[PDB]
Design a protein around this ligand. Sequence first.
Ligand code: HEM
Length: 289
Amino acid sequence: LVHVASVEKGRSYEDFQKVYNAIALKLREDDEYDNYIGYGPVLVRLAWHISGTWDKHDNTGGSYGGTYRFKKEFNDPSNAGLQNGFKFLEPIHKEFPWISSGDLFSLGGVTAVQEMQGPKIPWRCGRVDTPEDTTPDNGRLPDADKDAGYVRTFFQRLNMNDREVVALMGAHALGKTHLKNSGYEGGGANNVFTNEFYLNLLNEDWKLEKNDANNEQWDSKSGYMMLPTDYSLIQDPKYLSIVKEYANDQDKFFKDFSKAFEKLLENGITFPKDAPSPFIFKTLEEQGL
Ligand code: HEM
């Protein structure tokens, strides 16, 4: 199954920076969302979940087709709460009707990471919307109540190795769990991208507790929380080594996260040899906007 990137007609870096800017401006404007966390974290999560359906074996799912817009996928129980991110992006898509859905969703994620002071994430245009019947079935996104072996195996389907998995999970520094979405509650509620997930894993005093939805989670007196799959990264000795590396090297984490997030967002896509180079968008702050 082959998906070839096709640039929206006539569009260049400048067009997509405009889209970036609109998303970034709306992120600053609608600052009250989720108890003043803002839409940053849910847009990152949306970009991952639209990409996380990918299957390297037959190239079903993946960000290319923009299939989150179809009910089967936006109603996936794994995607509960993502509708907020989609609703955010709706006026963006109305203003820039030329961008594809997959490009918009992935770009939402990139814009969110950068505006929250994360690393630059090179981004490539050219995803093309595909019909309803290409929508992957529910069930391809990962469970939270599992261990290190589950996590490692899960991510093999997205062609990610130990380093990539540990790097990607660092996004859980952002936002929080919502009992009504996932059966988990709590969390940092941070909207600044840093390597704190690793620091928290290593430095907090964690207690295995049951939440109000009758699910187990790791809680700290400090008020942080970790999913069983998060916590598995310090139970497994290979994952633990990498957790300690990122906890001790902000720049290294930023560099690896950037590589892994782009890869994630680009899985399944074939880029023509003469496609444009990846775009690196300036932040509003860099633009003085
Ligand atoms: C084994 C892997 C993963 C599991 C089981 C998982 C699970 C979860 C769960 C259950 C939530 C809370 C949803 C809700 O209640 O609102 C959460 C939140 C989130 N996830 Fe993950 N996740 C995983 C990996 C990732 C990765 C790879 C990314 C992105 C690079 C990511 C980004 C986030 C972020 C940004 C949120 C915060 C959402 C917001 O605050 O609304 N997740 N995830």
